[PDB]
Design a binder for these strands. Structure first.
Ligand SMILES: NC(=O)COCCOCC(N)=O
Ligand SMILES: Cn1cc(N)cc1C(=O)O
Ligand SMILES: Cn1cc(N)cc1C(=O)O
Ligand SMILES: Cn1cc(N)cc1C(=O)O
Ligand SMILES: Cn1cc(N)cc1C(=O)O
Ligand SMILES: Cn1cc(N)cc1C(=O)O
Ligand SMILES: Cn1cc(N)cc1C(=O)O
Ligand SMILES: Cn1cc(N)cc1C(=O)O
Ligand SMILES: Cn1cc(N)cc1C(=O)O
Ligand SMILES: Cn1cc(N)cc1C(=O)O
Ligand SMILES: Cn1cc(N)cc1C(=O)O
Ligand SMILES: Cn1cc(N)cc1C(=O)O
Ligand SMILES: Cn1cc(N)cc1C(=O)O
Ligand SMILES: Cn1cc(N)nc1C(=O)O
Ligand SMILES: Cn1cc(N)nc1C(=O)O
Ligand SMILES: Cn1cc(N)nc1C(=O)O
Ligand SMILES: Cn1cc(N)nc1C(=O)O
Ligand SMILES: [Cl-]
Ligand SMILES: [Cl-]
Ligand SMILES: [Cl-]
Ligand SMILES: [Cl-]
Ligand SMILES: [Mn+2]
Ligand SMILES: [Mn+2]
Ligand SMILES: [Mn+2]
Ligand SMILES: [Mn+2]
Ligand SMILES: [Mn+2]
Ligand SMILES: [Mn+2]
Ligand SMILES: [Mn+2]
Ligand SMILES: [Mn+2]
Ligand SMILES: [Mn+2]
Ligand SMILES: [Mn+2]
Ligand SMILES: [Mn+2]
Ligand SMILES: [Mn+2]
Ligand SMILES: [Mn+2]
Ligand SMILES: [Mn+2]
Lengths: 98, 107, 98, 81, 101, 107, 88, 99
DNA sequence: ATCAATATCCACCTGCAGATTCTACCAAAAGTGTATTTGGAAACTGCTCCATCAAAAGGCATGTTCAGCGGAATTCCGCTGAACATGCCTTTTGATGGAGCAGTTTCCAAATACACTTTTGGTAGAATCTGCAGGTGGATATTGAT
DNA sequence: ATCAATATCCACCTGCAGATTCTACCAAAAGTGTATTTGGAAACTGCTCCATCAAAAGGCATGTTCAGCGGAATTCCGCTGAACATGCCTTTTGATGGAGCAGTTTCCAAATACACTTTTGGTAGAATCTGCAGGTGGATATTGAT
């Protein structure tokens, strides 16, 4: 009769992406844990690099621009190209809307 | 009424959550509005890239469920992902079949 | 009176284990080893089962990758047999000895 | 008897080598391997224990290990992060 | 005057490094290039210890970096003997500081 | 009315106040305890003392009165723990430790 | 626009055989194969391309046109090759 | 009747000489052009602080010297005293730069 | 080349651990409007230092000759690991108290941002000082031919 | 093992760049005191899931035989080190235009903390459903002896 504090994870969001890429494909529990680790890992690396970028340039704010440069610093060629395009597209749609 | 930032950006990944994680993680004093959206998009895209390749590996093995093994095959067989995860161990992933030619039986 | 020549079964084993993902060291012996080593740092410790498994996954992945490097060193010296000096060279270049 | 480190048997070490693509193994490899594994475990466990003590626990958790592996440049996926 | 221009001052650990140098080797000097190296060393270690302390606090869901986090970070970062001595100097400094106000 | 530097109170040469401030601007955490910067300044001061002790000795060994990068490198690389702490660090103008592999020698 | 900045080309050959010999000597090398020089040039080119790419990325992010010692130092740190002696 | 040192004697002398000093071993101007040429291919119209070029040179030489030490070890491992491309290739592969 | 012993494959089958589906619960979180605050772009511009042409010159790269001896191909044999069957003892598996990892609530020592007040670490300037780089040469090794 | 061609050691000597010395001034910073706020140590403790024990499971320790790998011994081609002549281009000492990095101040687009309110996202006890690991059968490829 306690509670068991909520332990967040990207599991549900990863699953949605899975269905968009392979509608008829499942994923085991262990595999999903691996994907959660992956998402957390990339988040930390990108955010950390963006953090250093802001600091190096004596800025108190982490903007889409730091995330972008961070992406170019961290991801390999083609991967960086697409990540940047996806990032820019998402911000546009977000800005260009309400 | 209110609309999730994710829906506005047209993403599956939680922009609101990413935003929250950015500050609590102590990355900077302030966080621009577009930062969490851009970041969520990058995370979603990378997620899609690996699941895409992992799904294919599963299909190639005549399976419908992606397991660790499939994530490893997808990553290690992809030059860029292999590089990105060059210092990561995927539990229960095994290794790629590979035997140095000089070890093979005599022609 | 069947008998496979030296190397045939070895080759067969390489193909088998490179296809599977199961842990190769037996659990109990590994767990005793882990507990013994930890005892030197802090007494009366307990381990979550997942902690020991994580330790075993990382240890085997490390040893498997080291064996690949070790094999490259043996082959460099025109041998097909790995020796201690091969493991030593590999670790030195990786900067684990260095 | 047979003390712990020896528990890591010859057949086990041979299986690891096989997965690593090794075809022939010198007799001296087995002891060399155990020594190497011991150093690896000592380094990782020492750090995992440090995280455990810092949290004032008596139980080493998977996360303690994951964090230890990560600062050692050996990130592990599948156990929490 | 005129339109002077206060070149923003750049801080360094130089004067403090100098003080420690004389304590250990009274008659030994240090070139500017070596001092730049020493300044890089102090900043590097500062960043590493602070970073380890930061993660450590986060892992335990704490929002405060205390001497206890610094101590654990020091043990995780420094090899054997250096850690032991650093911990003593650190502990001693804190215990002394808290007996002074 | 007697304002003593936190360093003096702590019996240190390194700047506690500066260290406290750097910890804040570095955004390492939301909050910083009072003993944190004292402990950290002590450790930085101790490590500096350790490397300067060894570098001064290297300088004396080479009959020099002024410590140069070469002396800092000689001190770090000849010392097991400092060498490990700085295992991935390059000291400019430090050169390397004299070391010729046995098999390369004559006769 | 200002004038002529002579086309830069084949500068990898500026890393001469004697220079490579010297580097190998500091590295404890006693004998060197004739093919080492080109192999070494290719390795240095990769090393420099990687570091310079990151350093320039820092430059552009700061909206500068001048690569600073700090841009290089930060780039080296990123790649796990921390350099002491040039700031930071 | 002329004097001549045996092959390897001067080489050993050079090792001792260079392991004792710290000066950069690559000509400065040629290195600077190399840096400018490579940078230019990435982005045109770039300027360089003189210390940025020196930082690149100190880092580049340290990287190559340490690589030659590893390479020498691989050659010695193969029972040779002469370093060859494959020694460099093995060293970089084990270091994880290549594979 | 010809059997003969084994391993390897593939199509098929089905038990079941683990993934999917349903239901009720609810605290943790995120969206938006309002008020208050400010980081940092914008515009003007001081001034550091980067690109560069200038010129003399010797440190050092280039290109060649010559042959010492290292790399590598070959032969070969002692021996050390691979393959294999035998009998057993260690590991695996499932059941079970209870040690602590945590969920919950309490409440004070301690972490600030702001206003003051002040000591000091930085710095622009020129002005005397000094450790040692580098040239010289004479005394002591190190080499290599005989 | 004596000898000569050379490199190496080295304490003495000194021009000079780099380091040290100060007068000067000063804006950026840090220290004690409220006054306001709260993170997280602390006490209590429910509920996992960890250590442990016994029975069922099945991998490994062990000695023999010998295939074939590793490395010693020998051979010699030709590559690479040493030495040397020639002269080029890097290095050094200087100066200048001015690109562009950076100091200073005006100011608004954008960011932040509640307070109020909504619907998710995570947890959990219950029943139901399935992808696929092994297990079997028969065919056939692989390996090895002759
Ligand atoms: N919602 C806000 O912006 C209020 O922040 C100010 C509270 O901090 C204490 C103080 N003296 O400033
Ligand atoms: C009335 N109201 C509605 C909001 N969303 C905010 C406020 C204030 O007041
Ligand atoms: C005073 N105030 C009122 C708001 N609604 C937000 C703030 C702040 O401050
Ligand atoms: C009005 N006020 C508020 C602060 N935090 C400081 C002061 C003084 O006075
Ligand atoms: C009057 N006052 C108000 C502050 N906040 C500080 C002081 C002093 O005095
Ligand atoms: C007198 N006083 C009033 C402050 N607020 C600070 C000081 C000091 O002194
Ligand atoms: C003397 N004093 C009074 C302050 N308000 C601060 C200081 C300092 O010193
Ligand atoms: C008078 N005073 C002196 C301080 N240091 C603070 C205050 C307030 O008031
Ligand atoms: C009101 N106040 C007075 C202080 N001296 C600090 C604060 C705050 O608020
Ligand atoms: C008083 N206040 C301060 C906030 N930032 C929000 C509110 C409301 O009301
Ligand atoms: C009245 N009020 C005060 C807040 N801070 C938010 C709201 C709403 O309503
Ligand atoms: C009415 N209201 C007042 C707030 N502060 C928020 C809301 C909503 O609704
Ligand atoms: C309707 N509403 C009123 C708020 N104050 C917040 C929300 C949401 O929805
Ligand atoms: C209605 N609403 C939705 C959001 N914020 C508000 C206020 O009111
Ligand atoms: C008064 N107020 C109402 C509101 N919605 N936010 C604020 C603030 O203040
Ligand atoms: C005198 N003092 C020194 C510090 N803070 C203060 C007040 O008053
Ligand atoms: C009024 N006051 C005086 C002081 N020294 N701090 C404060 C606050 O308030
Ligand atoms: Cl933004
Ligand atoms: Cl060996
Ligand atoms: Cl503290
Ligand atoms: Cl080669
Ligand atoms: Mn070009
Ligand atoms: Mn402002
Ligand atoms: Mn020429
Ligand atoms: Mn030979
Ligand atoms: Mn044997
Ligand atoms: Mn209890
Ligand atoms: Mn002063
Ligand atoms: Mn000298
Ligand atoms: Mn609280
Ligand atoms: Mn052989
Ligand atoms: Mn301009
Ligand atoms: Mn829901
Ligand atoms: Mn199957
Ligand atoms: Mn069958």
């Amino acid at each position: 009769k306690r509670r068991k504090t909520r332990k967040e994870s990207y599991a549900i969001y990863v699953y949605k992406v899975l269905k968009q890429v392979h509608p008829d494909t499942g994923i085991s529990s262990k595999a999903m844990s691996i994907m959660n680790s992956f998402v957390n890992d990339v988040f930390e690396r990108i955010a950390g690099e963006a953090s250093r970028l802001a600091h190096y340039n004596k800025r108190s704010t982490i903007t889409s621009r730091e995330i972008q440069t961070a992406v170019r610093l961290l991801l390999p060629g083609e991967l960086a190209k697409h990540a940047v395009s996806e990032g820019t597209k998402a911000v546009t749609k977000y800005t260009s809307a309400k | 009424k209110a609309k999730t930032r994710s829906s506005r950006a047209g993403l599956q990944f939680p922009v609101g959550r990413v935003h929250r994680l950015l500050r609590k993680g102590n990355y900077a004093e302030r966080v621009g509005a577009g930062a969490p959206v851009y970041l969520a998009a990058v995370l979603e895209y990378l997620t899609a890239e690996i699941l895409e390749l992992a799904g294919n590996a599963a299909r190639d093995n005549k399976k419908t469920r992606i397991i660790p093994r499939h994530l490893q095959l997808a990553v290690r067989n992809d030059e860029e992902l292999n590089k990105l995860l060059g210092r990561v161990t995927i539990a229960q992933g095994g290794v790629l079949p590979n035997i140095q030619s000089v070890l093979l039986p005599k022609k | 009176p069947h008998r496979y020549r030296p190397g045939t079964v070895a080759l067969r084993e390489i193909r088998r284990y490179q296809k599977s993902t199961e842990l190769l060291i037996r659990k109990l012996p590994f767990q005793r080893l882990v507990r013994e080593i930890a005892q030197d740092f802090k007494t009366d410790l307990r381990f979550q089962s997942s902690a020991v498994m994580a330790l075993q996954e990382a240890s085997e992945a490390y040893l498997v990758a080291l064996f690949e490097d070790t094999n490259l060193c043996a082959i460099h010296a025109k041998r097909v047999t790995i020796m201690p000096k091969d493991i030593q060279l590999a670790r030195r270049i990786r900067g684990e000895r260095a | 008897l047979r003390d712990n480190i020896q528990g890591i048997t010859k057949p086990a070490i041979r299986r690891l080598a096989r997965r690593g693509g090794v075809k022939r193994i010198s007799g001296l490899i087995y002891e060399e391997t155990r020594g190497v594994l011991k150093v690896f475990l000592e380094n990782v466990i020492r750090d995992a224990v440090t995280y455990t003590e810092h949290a004032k626990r008596k139980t080493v958790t998977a996360m303690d290990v994951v964090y230890a592996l990560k600062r050692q440049g050996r990130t592990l996926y599948g156990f929490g992060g």
